[PDB]
Design a protein around this ligand. Structure first.
Ligand code: NA
Lengths: 136, 136, 135
């Protein structure tokens, strides 16, 4: 498996930030990797990956709200037939992937940092992200 | 071998998203790397790298259009007299670099993911990105 | 395992601090020649970016534009602490950046420097980490 695993999620609304930290960690533990990096990569162009505050759900609510204002869903100048241009912008804005450091078997994250799958075009039943580990 | 290759682009307009997936894949094949990661990095402060929809050109058109509204070219509060502040914002917003996973001698990309060089201050004759592979 | 923590004290709400030289000094001390460096903020309100390292007006303008895109005060914010805008700016530039190391130097274009982006200062003992992976 080359320390690579695909994870599956079902999302429940257009916009959703799903904390995936524990899934990543549990799987690092399973592989036995102690030091290196983890690449966490959405397989989608309308859902991304970010790191942000892990405790107050109002942070992620406010992130979703602000991004909805920065990139409104409807725009008169949009040409992309599918209608989900805003989700493509949001995905490129937070990133499709994040690179995390692994030290002594743990993700190197501050106390309040968690890893989120950022759904911008839900609800969808088939969402996926990949985690790939590289060891020192 | 260092598994690092630099690529040259000439861009033809202020804003341009150029699909560079083939350059990256071709270099992976040439190096014989089967599993690991690829770091794709712009050498510029006014062009970045992103992963987004790789089939409908209207996605790229709309991305450029939306970014132009988020970061208008002319802004009364700008101090940077060269006049390309907006390009600097766009570059930091999409990122100067992306990290991709390599599995079975190919990039791990979802169905519609491609890698784009995002020119925000063209046309320019000597744009560069670097592809660095790391092996398992 | 070539990982080091660095502390910074920031001096205003918004500050872009050039950390390039600090990263490069670590690399030189470890003797790592080729690989990658992962530069990662430990904070949800400060990020890491790569941008223009010569003209201070670029980073002034970056801070200004970000403050317009994500205004500090917003009637619809529910996060009562008041620093929502810092969270958005952090996710927008990124909490971390990956840099290539070649011949003991960061692979950076002429005007490219690495910045710690404070969006909720001034604070003491802001931190980032640098992890090196060698070929
Ligand atoms: Na970003």
């Amino acid at each position: 498996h080359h320390h690579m695993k695909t994870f599956h999620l079902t999302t429940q609304s257009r916009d959703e930030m799903v904390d995936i930290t524990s899934q990543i960690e549990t799987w690092i533990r399973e592989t036995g990797v102690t030091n290196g990096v983890a690449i966490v990569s959405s397989l989608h162009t309308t859902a991304g990956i970010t790191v942000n505050e892990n405790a107050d759900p109002d942070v992620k609510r406010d992130m979703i709200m602000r991004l909805d204002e920065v990139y409104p869903w409807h725009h008169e100048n949009d040409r992309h037939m599918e209608g989900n241009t805003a989700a493509h912008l949001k995905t490129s804005t937070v990133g499709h992937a994040q690179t995390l450091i692994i030290s002594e078997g743990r993700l190197v994250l501050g106390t309040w940092q968690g890893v989120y799958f950022c759904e911008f075009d839900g609800p969808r039943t088939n969402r996926k992200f990949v985690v790939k580990l590289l060891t020192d």
